[PDB]
Design a protein around this ligand. Structure first.
Ligand SMILES: [Cl-]
Ligand SMILES: [Cl-]
Ligand SMILES: [Cl-]
Ligand SMILES: [Cl-]
Ligand SMILES: [Mn+2]
Ligand SMILES: [Mn+2]
Ligand SMILES: [Mn+2]
Ligand SMILES: [Mn+2]
Lengths: 9, 1345
């Protein structure tokens, strides 16, 4: 979990 | 005999002088006009600040002739310890009067004791208070004063212009220049006074404040008289160095002063300072060699830095010939920054140490001698304010110390700089002896000295005009023109200021001299003015006289754009230099001068140019140039419109392209270039030429100069880096020509057919056209091409040789010394999988050869012409030097060949073939030509840190890595606060300065330098010194550096005592293995040192010496052992396909398939089986460490605390990362595993590690909101204001994800509340979109503080 897939949510 | 006055006479005037004091009563010109001198009985002499009034018995007079009188003045004051005899000479010639102090006798002294000892009772200063050598009165018609003071601020004029009225009241009001006018006469006062005083604006000292004229009012009957006197002169000044030691230093020159009386010299019907200024040029000091300044059209810097030899002297000579072709032979001025020692900011202040890696004094002299035939002048950058321990001049006496007795530290970059004691350096005779060392090397070949930083108070708190005058004198005495850094510095002797000529530096307050008086007087003598740079406004908004705009293409500040350099010369510098061939005679309607800024009496005229600015200039042959401003209103488009006429004919018109790069203009010109590029004499009528430029491109019509009016045609050539091209015959009708020009393209116009300027590329370089500057034709005339492939000259900037397919490019070597050892190196960037080679042959047989496969290391050398910001291909540059070593054959028959072996379509680039004498002999080969051993003590390095190459830890930079030099005891551990030796063995070592905590490669070997054969084993060893434990590591990798794909071995501290490192390496299957030095994430141990001691101590440094690489014997293996090793490897990893990255599996398959090729080849030997086995063993240790790393990532993510401790004990890297940069610390902080976070941090995990998006562990701690983890990270050194890809700090991720107490913790630790996201979002704006009401009010209170 880096920001890319975390933002997407 | 009884009469107390005499008369001196010339054909222009009669001067009545007094017998009781060296004073003038009045000057009477031939036409009867009168100028007053000192109408009152004033007989004051000041010595050492004490005024003494002289009586009749204190003065003797003698009239030598009609043009000269001598005075002897007895100047005495017992109470003040003054007993002197001053001899004064008054002489007249034409409209000039000179007053010279020809002798000073001190009755209270025997002189300056040997070694500049203190002279007790020395006469230090002298002046004649209110001497009024010339004066004007309020009762005279148009009585006025014009004065100039130093201003480097584009918005603040240095001039004052006012009427002299009954209310005028001044007492010793000091100016650089001062002129008085009244009753039809004008005069300025010149003096050689070194007095420093009042200035308008200046960021530095260093002669900026020199004011030489004192104005004083007195009553003369019912009128107020304003008189001019010289400011005080220094005679035997007593000074103190940084240790308290005192010296008395003799005068730079004896006191001198003069006046020149003018009538209406410019014949415009008015008498003002401009008439006095024209006459003043006949008496004023002129900077040494200022007569060549109009010829210096192409100024630029050629840089060398950090032992790299980016620009050897013979390459600089080729770049001079390229600029000569492109400008049709205009004069040049090349500033060699880094000419000495290891390069720029190395070896200061050893002026005589010419860079041996650049070719030494011999190549420097060849470059200067041959360059002078192309009108190129050269000069060197020196420093007299800062020095490095390596310099032989470095001594305790040279060291500047503070009031506490500690070092006055300078800048730390390659080494720690230390201030020089400026007063000691002068008074001891040390500086002048170091300039004498340089003079022995260059003889009379060098044109100028560029003195860096002088005036910034690094050498002492003074650096005044007296020190600057002595500094300029020791330079001028060696035949060198004076140039310096600061725009305002050295008004007396400087002909160029870098911060005046390069307009981008410093901003509007720190540019060249903003003075109409100074520029009127000396525009033709200096490049020290304000040029066009409209964002600065005022003086920088389209000055009519232009002003030097300096660009570079040879590495200075990374500047490499040749086309922009040439475009800039034609845009601003050709017209600026054209204007400098004339002297200002009239200047009216200056919009910068108003009643409000002290210039109410400024020279105006509504009948000239519609009342808008106009300047008239003339040469000694009567030629007239008129420069006019379109409008004086800065809101008008015509403010930037300028017309130039030459003898009444328009030669330029329009708006220049903004000097700040902000807007292209429309200026066109057809400038007659009538002068040669040497002394600037007129060229013969037949070879007179015109330069044409058209900013927007198009067609313009012009009236040719008078001597061209009867021609029927002209020849026009387009100028390129190849010279004159595209000749056109253009008809002339009615003395006019029409020219069609491409935008921003230079053309030269001749009366008839012109010859090409002759250029022999690469003189002294042993090959013709070593830099591929000769165009496509070089591959026909100089180099011989053979093969089925393609060879071409490519690159619109720095041209290179580009090879495709199977091709050889050869050239015979010349001027070699038979039996002598040579190194030949060439820059190579190979994008092909096939080999690129350099070979030296003799009579068909090979003397030496070397090859590179695909290049693996990008070039990060900022001052180098092919660094990775210059786009060799696909937005990068992998240029690195490839060496061969050979002995020149007795037959004198040697040839170099550059080749590409493969037949594929990928490119190979070569450039800069350098053949140099070199004694390195540390390589031994096996019978097959492969490496047996490579040793290097770095004592014979042709350039750089070979066999290593600088890596990307600082990006493209003037890299803080170089060859350190021995100078004991100053370079050894134990001197001052220094704890590390710069050099481990001999005189040289490789030094890394302060590159700690980069988490990346610092330098590495590359295959073209040291080739490690696939499967072969090597023992590598070296001596080192490292400042702290685990700050630097040995790195081993294969191919282009990739984080995670290298093997690291932390090096332990060796501070002040040399350590030894040794390891083994097995060559990778692709022949691309390398080893290097890596900067870890570990913080250095500063041992309680503070300030400069943190850098000078060596705690953050790494020194390497005595490198040894040797092929070793490996245990012999049979084909069966190699085959069994394959099955063992496959059994361990073939099943882990899904558990691996797509790139990790392909790298595994690549090694496996290649090891099997070795095993199964027909005719394989035990060497092949042993190599295949060793490759598989290395692959095994790599895959085993990769698995432990991904298992540690999984254990930190899933919270398996025990698994983390045992995985790191087995071999998992605490700083392991996935394909996206996610470390175990990133995973434990996101998951909330506090104990794992603490254990990882204790083991050495990088608290500030970034992933691909710039997200740190602290950023990831805000997704769920782990409060205890945020406290731990912050405590260990996490950056509270770390910004990721979208500009979000940890504070922005906490507010966007709605976690209140994290925000409170971040705000407490110092997270700047003013910080903005990649949008217009402060931490307050993030809370509005997520309903975090309590957050918004808390940080609102903190922001108001
Ligand atoms: Cl406008
Ligand atoms: Cl325009
Ligand atoms: Cl590549
Ligand atoms: Cl070498
Ligand atoms: Mn006049
Ligand atoms: Mn080149
Ligand atoms: Mn050494
Ligand atoms: Mn050094």
């Amino acid at each position: 979990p880096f920001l890319a897939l975390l933002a997407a949510x | 005999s009884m009469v107390a006055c005499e008369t001196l006479k010339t054909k222009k005037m009669e001067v009545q002088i007094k017998k009781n004091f060296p004073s003038v009563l009045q000057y009477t010109m031939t036409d009867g006009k009168v100028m007053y001198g000192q109408s009152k009985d004033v007989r004051t002499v000041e010595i050492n600040g004490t005024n003494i009034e002289l009586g009749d018995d204190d003065v003797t007079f003698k009239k030598v002739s009609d043009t000269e009188a001598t005075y002897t003045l007895k100047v005495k004051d017992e109470a003040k310890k003054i007993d002197a005899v001053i001899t004064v000479q008054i002489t007249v010639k034409a409209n000039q009067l000179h007053l010279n102090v020809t002798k000073i006798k001190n009755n209270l002294s025997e002189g300056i004791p040997e070694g500049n000892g203190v002279e007790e009772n020395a006469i230090q200063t002298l002046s004649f208070p209110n001497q009024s050598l010339v004066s004007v009165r309020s009762s005279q018609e148009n009585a006025q004063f014009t004065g100039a003071r130093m201003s480097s601020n584009t918005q603040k004029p240095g001039d004052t212009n006012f009427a002299v009225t009954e209310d005028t009241n001044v007492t010793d009001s000091d100016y650089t220049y001062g002129f008085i006018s009244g009753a039809g006469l004008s005069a300025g006062l010149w003096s050689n006074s070194e007095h420093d005083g009042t200035y308008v604006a200046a960021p530095v000292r260093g002669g900026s404040q020199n004011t030489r004229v004192y104005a004083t009012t007195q009553q003369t009957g019912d009128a107020t008289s304003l008189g001019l006197a010289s400011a005080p002169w220094y005679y035997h000044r007593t000074v103190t160095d940084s240790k308290g030691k005192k010296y008395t230093v003799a005068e730079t020159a004896l006191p001198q002063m003069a006046v020149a009386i003018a009538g209406d010299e410019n014949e415009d019907g008015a008498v003002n300072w401009q008439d006095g200024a024209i006459a003043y040029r006949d008496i004023m000091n002129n900077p040494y060699k200022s007569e060549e300044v109009p010829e210096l059209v192409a100024w630029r810097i050629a840089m060398n830095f950090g032992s790299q030899a980016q620009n050897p002297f013979l390459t600089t000579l080729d770049n001079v010939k390229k600029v000569a072709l492109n400008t049709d032979g205009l004069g040049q001025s090349v500033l060699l920054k880094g000419y000495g020692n290891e390069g720029h900011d190395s070896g200061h202040p050893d002026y005589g140490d010419i860079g041996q890696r650049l070719g030494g004094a011999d190549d420097m002299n060849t470059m200067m001698e041959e360059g002078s035939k192309y009108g190129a002048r050269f000069g060197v950058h020196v420093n007299a304010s800062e020095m490095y321990p390596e310099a032989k001049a470095f001594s305790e006496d040279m060291v500047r110390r503070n009031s506490a007795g500690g070092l006055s530290y300078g800048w730390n970059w390659l080494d720690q700089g230390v201030g020089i004691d400026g007063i000691y350096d002068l008074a001891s005779g040390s500086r002048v002896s170091r300039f004498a060392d340089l003079s022995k090397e260059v003889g009379d070949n060098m044109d100028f000295i560029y003195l860096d930083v002088w005036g910034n108070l690094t050498s002492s708190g003074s650096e005044d005009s007296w020190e600057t005058r002595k500094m300029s004198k020791m330079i001028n005495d060696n035949g060198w023109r004076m140039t310096t850094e600061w725009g305002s510095g050295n008004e007396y002797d400087s002909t160029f200021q870098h911060w005046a000529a390069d307009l981008t530096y410093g901003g509007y307050t720190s540019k060249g001299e903003n003075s109409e008086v100074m520029r009127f007087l000396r525009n033709h003598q200096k490049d020290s003015w304000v040029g066009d740079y409209p964002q600065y406004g005022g003086a920088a908004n389209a000055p009519l006289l232009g002003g030097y705009n300096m660009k570079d293409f040879e590495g200075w500040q990374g500047r490499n754009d040749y086309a922009a350099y040439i475009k800039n010369l034609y845009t601003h510098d050709v017209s600026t230099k054209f204007i400098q061939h004339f002297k200002v005679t009239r200047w009216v309607n200056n919009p910068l001068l108003t009643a409000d800024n002290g210039n109410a009496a400024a020279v105006s005229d509504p009948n000239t140019n519609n009342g808008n600015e106009q300047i008239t200039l003339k040469d000694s042959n009567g030629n007239v140039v008129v420069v006019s401003r379109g409008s004086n209103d800065t809101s008008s488009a015509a403010y930037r419109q300028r017309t130039i006429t030459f003898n009444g004919v328009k030669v330029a018109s329009g708006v220049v392209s903004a000097g700040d790069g902000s807007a292209t203009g429309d200026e066109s010109y057809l400038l007659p270039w009538m002068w040669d590029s040497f002394t600037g004499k007129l060229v013969k009528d037949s070879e007179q030429k015109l330069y044409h430029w058209n900013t927007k491109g198009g067609t313009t019509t012009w009236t040719l100069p008078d001597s061209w009016k009867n021609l029927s045609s002209v020849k026009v050539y387009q100028l390129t880096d190849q010279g004159k091209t595209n000749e056109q015959t253009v008809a002339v009708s009615g003395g006019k020509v029409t020219l069609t020009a491409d935008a921003e393209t230079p053309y030269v116009v001749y009366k008839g057919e012109a010859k090409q300027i002759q250029v022999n590329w690469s003189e002294g370089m042993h090959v013709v056209d070593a830099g591929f500057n000769g165009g496509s034709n070089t591959l026909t005339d100089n180099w011989t091409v053979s093969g089925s492939g393609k060879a071409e000259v490519e690159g619109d900037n720095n041209a290179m040789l580009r090879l495709t397919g199977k091709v050889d490019v050869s050239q015979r070597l010349t001027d070699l010394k038979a039996g002598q050892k040579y190194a030949l190196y060439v820059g190579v960037d190979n994008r092909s999988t096939g080999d690129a080679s350099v070979t030296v042959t003799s009579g068909g047989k090979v003397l030496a050869t070397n090859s590179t496969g695909k290049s693996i290391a990008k070039n990060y050398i900022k001052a180098y012409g092919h660094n990775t910001n210059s786009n060799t291909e696909n937005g990068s540059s992998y240029f690195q030097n490839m060496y061969v070593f050979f002995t020149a054959p007795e037959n004198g028959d040697a040839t170099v060949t550059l080749s590409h072996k493969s037949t594929d379509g990928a490119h190979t680039y070569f450039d800069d073939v350098r053949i140099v004498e070199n004694q390195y002999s540390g390589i031994t080969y096996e019978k097959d030509g492969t490496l047996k051993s490579l040793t290097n003590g770095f004592e014979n390095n042709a350039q750089g840190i070979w066999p290593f190459v600088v890596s990307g830890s600082e990006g493209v930079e003037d890299n803080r890595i170089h060859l350190s030099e021995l100078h004991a005891p100053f370079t050894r551990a134990g001197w001052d606060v220094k704890k590390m030796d710069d050099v481990l063995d001999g005189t040289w070592s490789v030094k890394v300065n302060g590159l700690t905590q980069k988490g990346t490669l610092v330098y590495q070997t590359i295959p073209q330098n040291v080739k490690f054969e696939a499967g072969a084993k090597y023992k590598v060893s070296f001596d080192y010194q490292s400042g702290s434990d685990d700050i630097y590591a040995i790195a081993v990798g294969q191919g282009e550096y990739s984080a995670g794909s290298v093997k690291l071995t932390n090096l332990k501290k060796a501070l002040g005592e040399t350590g030894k490192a040794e390891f083994e390496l097995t060559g990778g299957v692709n022949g691309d293995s390398w080893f290097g030095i890596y900067s870890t994430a570990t913080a250095p141990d500063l041992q309680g040192s503070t300030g400069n001691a943190q850098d000078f101590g060596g705690y953050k440094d790494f020194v390497l010496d005595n490198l040894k690489i040797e092929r070793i014997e490996s245990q012999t293996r049979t084909k069966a052992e190699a085959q069994d090793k394959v099955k063992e490897i496959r059994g361990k990893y073939d099943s882990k396909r899904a558990e691996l990255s797509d790139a990790a599996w392909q790298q595994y398959q690549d090694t496996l398939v290649k090891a099997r090729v070795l095993i199964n080849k027909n005719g394989a030997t035990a060497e092949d089986f042993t190599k295949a086995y060793d490759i598989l063993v290395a692959l095994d240790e790599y895959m085993k460490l990769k698995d432990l790393d991904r298992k540690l990532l999984e254990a930190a993510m899933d919270g398996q605390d025990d698994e983390v401790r045992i995985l790191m004990a087995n071999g998992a890297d605490v700083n392991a990362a996935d394909e996206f940069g996610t470390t175990p610390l990133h995973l434990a902080a996101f998951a909330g595993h506090l104990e794992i976070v603490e254990v990882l941090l204790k083991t050495g995990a990088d608290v500030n590690a970034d992933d691909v998006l710039g997200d740190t562990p602290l950023h990831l701690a805000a997704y769920f909101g782990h409060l205890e983890i945020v406290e731990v990270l912050l405590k260990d050194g996490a950056d509270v204001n770390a910004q990721d890809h979208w500009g979000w700090t940890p504070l922005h991720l906490a507010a966007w994800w709605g976690h209140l107490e994290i925000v409170e913790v971040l705000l407490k630790h110092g997270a700047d509340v003013n910080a903005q996201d990649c949008f217009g979002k402060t931490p307050f704006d993030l809370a509005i979109d997520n309903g975090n009401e309590d957050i918004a009010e808390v940080l609102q209170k903190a922001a108001k503080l």
